[PDB]
Amino acid sequence: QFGASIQQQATVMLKIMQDYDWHVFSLVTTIFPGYRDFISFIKTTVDNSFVGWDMQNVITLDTSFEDAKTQVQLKKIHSSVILLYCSKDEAVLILSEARSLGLTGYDFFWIVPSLVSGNTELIPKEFPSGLISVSYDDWDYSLE
Amino acid sequence: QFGASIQQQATVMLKIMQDYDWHVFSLVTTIFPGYRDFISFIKTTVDNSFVGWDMQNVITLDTSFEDAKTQVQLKKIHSSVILLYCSKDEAVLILSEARSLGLTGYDFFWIVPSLVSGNTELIPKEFPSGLISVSYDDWDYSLE
Amino acid sequence: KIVNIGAVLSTRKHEQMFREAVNQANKRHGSWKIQLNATSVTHKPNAIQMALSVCEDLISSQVYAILVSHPPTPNDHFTPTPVSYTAGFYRIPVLGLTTRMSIYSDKSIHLSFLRTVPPYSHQSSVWFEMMRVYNWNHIILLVSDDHEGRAAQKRLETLLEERESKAEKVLQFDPGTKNVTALLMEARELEARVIILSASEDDAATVYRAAAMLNMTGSGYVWLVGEREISGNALRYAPDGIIGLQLINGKNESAHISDAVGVVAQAVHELLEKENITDPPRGCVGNTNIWKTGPLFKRVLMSSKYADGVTGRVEFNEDGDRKFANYSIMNLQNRKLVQVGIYNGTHVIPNDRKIIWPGGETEKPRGYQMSTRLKIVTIHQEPFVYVKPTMSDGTCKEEFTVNGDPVKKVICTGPNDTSPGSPRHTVPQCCYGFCIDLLIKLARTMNFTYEVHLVADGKFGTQERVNNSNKKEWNGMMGELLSGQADMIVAPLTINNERAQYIEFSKPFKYQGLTILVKKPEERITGINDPRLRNPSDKFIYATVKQSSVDIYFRRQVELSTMYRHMEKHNYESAAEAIQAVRDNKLHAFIWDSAVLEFEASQKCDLVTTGELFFRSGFGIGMRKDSPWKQNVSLSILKSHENGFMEDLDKTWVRYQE
């Protein structure tokens, strides 16, 4: 194939966070596979950075949420930048739960990977206007 | 009457909260009557105490909860000590929603008055084991 | 298949109208097999046996709705309470129709009471609509009925929660007395003229006579009353031009009965469409089991929404009150009731008739007149507030300074000594000095008179527990200012964060720090960083003025609790006591402001200050809350800052040495 990997995309997103000095952040991971490599890559990137990042503990989901034990970990979130790694189906429920929590504020940023960013036409109403996404979908360079 | 009013009982409960340094707390008031006097007495007692109480804003109710607009006010709660003034049949639904939203943790406290705590025999299973109550029902002093 | 309705009604014509409304209630509801029976009872002049007859007759009848419809009762108690209490024993809704007392608003007391009339506190919201129209902020409350007084205060604080303003004066007392004119004169000395009254007819007529004898009904005096205050001899004692309220169809019983029949009938036909039907048992003999669908039928009555009636959109709130009520606004023009406004549920519209006021023009009188004589209180500051006894009788010896400046004194009033020393000795003497000349400059800039008096003690004022009910109170200059007896504290006020939360501050005129007074081996201390003062003993005797703001500033310091425990055994009343004590070589250190001890070192060479300069702060003028005496006064202070008038005040006392 072509393009970047999920590790190079994570490097680009941490470069975005480095260029804006958003050093206080968090990390929320679901049960989508390839997640422990993602967490370990974030840990080795923070360990290989000139920043000294303020990383909150990883909020790990288990199943479809009862909104009883996951809410305890969601109320621990006092940082600004919220890092979410999930699929498109669970992202609607996560953003709706965060909107019900009031954790979708002006300082509460949301940066998502490329695979959760699905169809350009199909956009659910639960997306915050200002949702940061990174993908290789370039319209200036066509297929030819 | 040979009894103990709700104002002196609120004084005793705030004395308990002062003796435990439980200064960060909240207040949930339903549509059970005699509630604005309770809020005003709490406001005057906080304004006339050496603590300087860190009081979260009052979660108010209008009817039986839709779990749509009251859900936002309950998700604003992140403090430990929770005060409540309601009836027993309302308190069953309140504790059911609090268990459904995970507000019955080890950090979170629950202090109720004597009017919501009715018969000693009739105890439903939805009550958290550790529910703080203050009642003047002394079994050592009989009616005679 | 039957529904019984109980009623306490007197006149046979309205009983026939009630039975006709019951008969016409089953007209448009089809040919359904439900039946409606009505049982009406008369009235015996007593109240215990009336309650007995009505309660056992409605137990034997097993009714669902209980109605009391007697306005013109000769007894002024107006109590349908025992039948409502007996129905609340089985949780049966009693629909009260006549009275508007706030004791019925408590659903904890009246468990199953509903009504279609609001209490009078909602009229205050209509009066808050006056605040939405006439743009008036400061009010004067006067409530005699203490059963509704707490509810009126609650509703007033609920209305003032939006604008976040404060009522200037509230009053609650026992109805029946007559010598309330002292508090009326105390409200007359205030800036506002808004008069809110909530009492019966007798106290309203009493305060009308009190305002008529003292002429408190002149120009600009805002009067705003209700329906209870425009009846009886209070209507005879009312001044011309007073604005009152009128309940539209408040006493018109005939349409009100039909409205109640429609409400009860649609509530019953709504309840018939649901399950869990229960019936009231024969509770007179051997039945104490409660009616289980009490709160269920109450919840049915909560969401009751209607569209029929001459009055209009009758609707219950969470308190079961009346929504969207047409009110009238009346005026008393030459002992004649003249309608000057109408009111829908949200908005006031005046009619084509004019609004003639008891004062001057037909427009609104702005009854917010600021105090042209500002009551000035101060403490006896030694280089700033010089107080001299009079020569012969209330006079001031006009002595001249060495720089050709005549001392412009003022006749101030002050106590003699402390309260164990002097029981009651308060004389007028001559006050002059620094802040007196500052007030002379303020009176030269802006034209306003003043009234200089003195604080009763030698303390600034601290936040202390009062000896009952665990309540915070202030004292001193703050205690005399917040009580309304003072207007402007002209004193070197120590600016801190605690007092900024309670009152508003002006710009500081003085800028200085703190220092140590010693007498002249290390004879100097060089500030707080002396390790021997960290762990003191009986040798280094250091203290401060009792109940001073320096002690509060050290109380915020959570790392110097040892000095807070040490200085509490030697706190003096005034700073001059500390000057006299260190003059006799009994003290050793004293934390105090800089330039005062610099002036005292210029007076006495043995008084030596320390070298360090910490707590570099400023002293300004003690002020009230949001007030028009803030911006212009602060601009005058800044005008005094920009020119050489600060240097002139230095030439008077600061730059002058010996």
Show the CA angle centred on residue A26, arms to residues A21 and A30, nearest 5°: 140
A72 touches chain B (CB under 8 A): yes
Query: Helices B36-47 and B6-19 meet at what angle, rounded to 10?
Result: 40
Q: Are strands C607-608 and C518-519 parallel, antiparallel or unpaired?
A: antiparallel
Whole-Å CA distances, C203 to C180, C200, C331: 10, 6, 21
Rounded Cα distance, C312 and C314, in Å? 6
Give yes or no for a contact between C132 and C85, defined as CB atoms under 8 angstroms apart: no
Whole-Å CA distances, A113 to A81, A102, A131, B68, C503: 14, 22, 11, 30, 53
Residues 219-278 of C with CB under 8 A from B: none
Nearest chain A residue to B68, by CA: A100
Segment (H or E) for C651: none
Give yes or no for a contact between A52 and A80, defined as CB atoms under 8 angstroms apart: no
Show the CA angle centred on residue C578, arms to residues C573 and C579, nearest 5°: 135
C150 touches chain B (CB under 8 A): yes
Nearest chain B residue to A101, by CA: B75
Show the CA angle centred on residue C454, arms to residues C453 and C455, nearest 5°: 135
Question: Environment class of residue C182 by beta-carbon count within 10 Å: exposed (0-12), middle (13-18) or buried (19+)?
Answer: exposed
C279 touches chain B (CB under 8 A): no
In Å, the largest CA–CA distance within chain A is 51
Secondary structure of residue C562 in the 3-state scheme? helix
Q: What is the 3-state secondary structure (H, E, C) of C208-219?
A: HHHHHHCCCCCC
C-alpha R_g of chain A: 15
Beta bridge partners of C452: C376
Task: Tell me whether residue B144 is annotated as binding.
Answer: no
DSSP C349-415: EE-SS----SSSSSS--------SEEEEEE---TTTEEEE--SSSS-----B-TTS-B---EEEEEE
Beta bridge partners of C287: none
Segment (H or E) for C270: helix C253-271
What lies within 8 Å, CB to CB, of C375 at 6+ separation is: C450, C451, C453, C485, C486, C487, C488
Rounded Cα distance, C88 and C94, in Å? 8
Residue C152, CA atoms < 13 Å, CB-side half-sphere = 24
Substitution target from C471, C474, C497, C501 for chain B, most B beta carbons within 10 A: C471
Residues 296-335 of C with CB under 8 A from B: 302, 318
- B touches C (3+ CB pairs < 8 Å)? yes
In Å, the largest CA–CA distance within chain C is 113
Structure tokens at C202: 């007798």
Chain A partners within 8 Å of B97 (Cβ): none
Query: Helices C146-163 and C121-133 meet at what angle, rounded to 10?
Result: 30
CB atoms near residue C29 (< 10 Å): 14
CB atoms near residue C436 (< 10 Å): 23
What lies within 8 Å, CB to CB, of C475 at 6+ separation is: C457, C459, C461, C462, C464, C547
Nearest chain A residue to B108, by CA: A72
Task: Single out the residue of C645, C637, C460, C655 nearest to residue C545, CA to CA.
Answer: C460
Place of tokens 């005040």: C649
C497 touches chain B (CB under 8 A): no
CB atoms near residue B74 (< 10 Å): 20
A69 touches chain B (CB under 8 A): yes
Whole-Å CA distances, C303 to C96, C309, C315: 18, 18, 9
Place of tokens 């009904």: C217
Rounded Cα distance, C308 and C81, in Å? 29
Nearest chain B residue to A77, by CA: B78
Fill in the amino acid letter for C562: T
Rounded Cα distance, C495 and C508, in Å? 9
Residue A49, CA atoms < 13 Å, CB-side half-sphere = 20
Rounded Cα distance, C107 and C115, in Å? 12
Structure tokens at A97: 């739960």
Give yes or no for a contact between C592 and C575, defined as CB atoms under 8 angstroms apart: yes
Fill in the amino acid letter for B38: F
Give yes or no for a contact between C240 and C330, defined as CB atoms under 8 angstroms apart: no
**For chain A, first and last CA: distance in Å?**
16
Yes or no, beta carbons of B100 and A67 under 8 Å apart: yes
Q: What is the 3-state secondary structure (H, E, C) of B11-55?
A: HHHHHHHHHCCCCEEEEEECCCCCCHHHHHHHHHHHHCCCCCCEE
Give yes or no for a contact between C28 and C100, defined as CB atoms under 8 angstroms apart: no
What lies within 8 Å, CB to CB, of B139 at 6+ separation is: none
Secondary structure of residue C469 in the 3-state scheme? coil
Rounded Cα distance, C607 and B110, in Å? 61
Whole-Å CA distances, C210 to C183, C223, C245, C520: 11, 14, 22, 67
Give yes or no for a contact between B62 and C318, defined as CB atoms under 8 angstroms apart: yes
Whole-Å CA distances, B8 to B31, B38, B45, C6, C107: 22, 11, 11, 41, 21
Show the CA angle centred on residue C633, arms to residues C654 and C220, nearest 5°: 145
- The shares of helix, strand and coil residues in chain B, as percent rounded to the nearest 5, are 30, 15, 55
Beta bridge partners of C331: C243, C338
Task: Single out the residue of C319, C308, C579, C469 nearest to residue B36, CA to CA.
Answer: C319
Give yes or no for a contact between C200 and C77, defined as CB atoms under 8 angstroms apart: no
Rounded Cα distance, C83 and C51, in Å? 6
What lies within 8 Å, CB to CB, of C36 at 6+ separation is: C2, C3, C5, C22, C25, C26, C265
Segment (H or E) for A19: helix A6-19
CB atoms near residue C354 (< 10 Å): 12
Give yes or no for a contact between B117 and B86, defined as CB atoms under 8 angstroms apart: no
Rounded Cα distance, A75 and A71, in Å? 6
Yes or no, beta carbons of B47 and C472 under 8 Å apart: yes
Segment (H or E) for C516: strand C510-516
DSSP C46-66: -SHHHHHHHHHHHHHHT-SEE
Rounded Cα distance, C235 and C429, in Å? 50
Rounded Cα distance, A85 and A90, in Å? 10
Chain B partners within 8 Å of A101 (Cβ): 75
Task: Single out the residue of C133, C129, C95, C131 nearest to residue C112, CA to CA.
Answer: C95
Show the CA angle centred on residue C530, arms to residues C526 and C532, nearest 5°: 140
- CA torsion B87-B92-B94-B99 (nearest 10°) is 160
Rounded Cα distance, C412 and C407, in Å? 15
Segment (H or E) for C176: none
Rounded Cα distance, C256 and C14, in Å? 11
Rounded Cα distance, C107 and C599, in Å? 68
Place of tokens 């509060």: C552
Query: Helices C201-213 and C181-188 meet at what angle, rounded to 10?
Result: 60
Give yes or no for a contact between C85 and C308, defined as CB atoms under 8 angstroms apart: no
Per-residue b/e over C324-352, b at no fewer than 16 CB within 10 Å? ebebbbbbbbeeeeeebbbbeeeebeeee
C-alpha R_g of chain B: 15
Rounded Cα distance, C286 and C156, in Å? 47
Task: Single out the residue of C628, C627, C626, C625 nearest to residue C481, CA to CA.
Answer: C625
Give yes or no for a contact between A100 and B75, defined as CB atoms under 8 angstroms apart: yes
Task: Single out the residue of A1, A29, A21 nearest to residue A112, CA to CA.
Answer: A29
Rounded Cα distance, A77 and B75, in Å? 13
C472 touches chain B (CB under 8 A): yes
CB atoms near residue B116 (< 10 Å): 18
Structure tokens at C380: 């006896």
Give yes or no for a contact between C129 and C95, defined as CB atoms under 8 angstroms apart: no
Rounded Cα distance, C559 and C561, in Å? 6
Secondary structure of residue C422 in the 3-state scheme? coil
In this complex, the residue of A69, A72, A101 whose CB is nearest that of residue B75 is A101
Whole-Å CA distances, A76 to A27, A71, B124, C500: 12, 9, 31, 34
Place of tokens 């970047």: A4
Structure tokens at A74: 């969601």
Nearest chain C residue to B40, by CA: C154
Q: Are strands C464-465 and C472-473 parallel, antiparallel or unpaired?
A: antiparallel
Beta bridge partners of C493: C620
In Å, the largest CA–CA distance within chain B is 51
Rounded Cα distance, C228 and C252, in Å? 16
Nearest chain B residue to C295, by CA: B89
CB atoms near residue C272 (< 10 Å): 13
Alpha carbon of B37: minimum distance to chain C alpha carbons (Å): 8
Rounded Cα distance, C470 and B49, in Å? 7
Whole-Å CA distances, C256 to C121, C253, C319: 22, 5, 20
Secondary structure of residue C492 in the 3-state scheme? strand
In this structure, what DSSP letter does residue C593 have? Answer: E
Place of tokens 């097993």: C62
What lies within 8 Å, CB to CB, of C228 at 6+ separation is: C120, C199, C200, C201, C204
Structure tokens at C418: 């402390």
Rounded Cα distance, B82 and B27, in Å? 6
Fill in the amino acid letter for C354: K
C-alpha R_g of chain C: 35
In this structure, what DSSP letter does residue C169 have? Answer: B
Task: Tell me whether residue B97 is annotated as binding.
Answer: no
B122 touches chain A (CB under 8 A): no
Give yes or no for a contact between C390 and C428, defined as CB atoms under 8 angstroms apart: yes
CB atoms near residue C418 (< 10 Å): 12
Q: Are strands C337-343 and C410-415 parallel, antiparallel or unpaired?
A: unpaired
Fill in the amino acid letter for A108: F
Rounded Cα distance, C578 and C516, in Å? 12
Query: C331 φ, ψ to 5°?
Result: -130, 150
Fill in the amino acid letter for C276: N
Rounded Cα distance, B116 and B126, in Å? 14
Alpha carbon of B75: minimum distance to chain A alpha carbons (Å): 5
Beta bridge partners of C614: C514
Rounded Cα distance, C54 and C92, in Å? 14
Place of tokens 């209700």: C226
What resolution in angstroms, rounded to 1 decimal?
A: 4.1
Give yes or no for a contact between C515 and C594, defined as CB atoms under 8 angstroms apart: yes
Yes or no, beta carbons of A67 and B101 under 8 Å apart: yes
Give yes or no for a contact between C487 and C446, defined as CB atoms under 8 angstroms apart: no
Rounded Cα distance, C115 and C113, in Å? 7
Helices (H), C568-628: 575-583, 594-603
Task: Single out the residue of C592, C452, C614, C642 nearest to residue C527, CA to CA.
Answer: C614
Secondary structure of residue C235 in the 3-state scheme? helix
In this structure, what DSSP letter does residue C238 have? Answer: P
Cα torsion angle, C98, C100, C101, C107, sign: positive
Task: Single out the residue of C505, C502, C185, C191 nearest to residue C374, CA to CA.
Answer: C191
Rounded Cα distance, C492 and C477, in Å? 12
Query: C385 φ, ψ to 5°?
Result: -115, 95
What lies within 8 Å, CB to CB, of B85 at 6+ separation is: B28, B29, B30, B32, B34, B35, B38, B113, B116
Residues 77-106 of A with CB under 8 A from B: 100-102
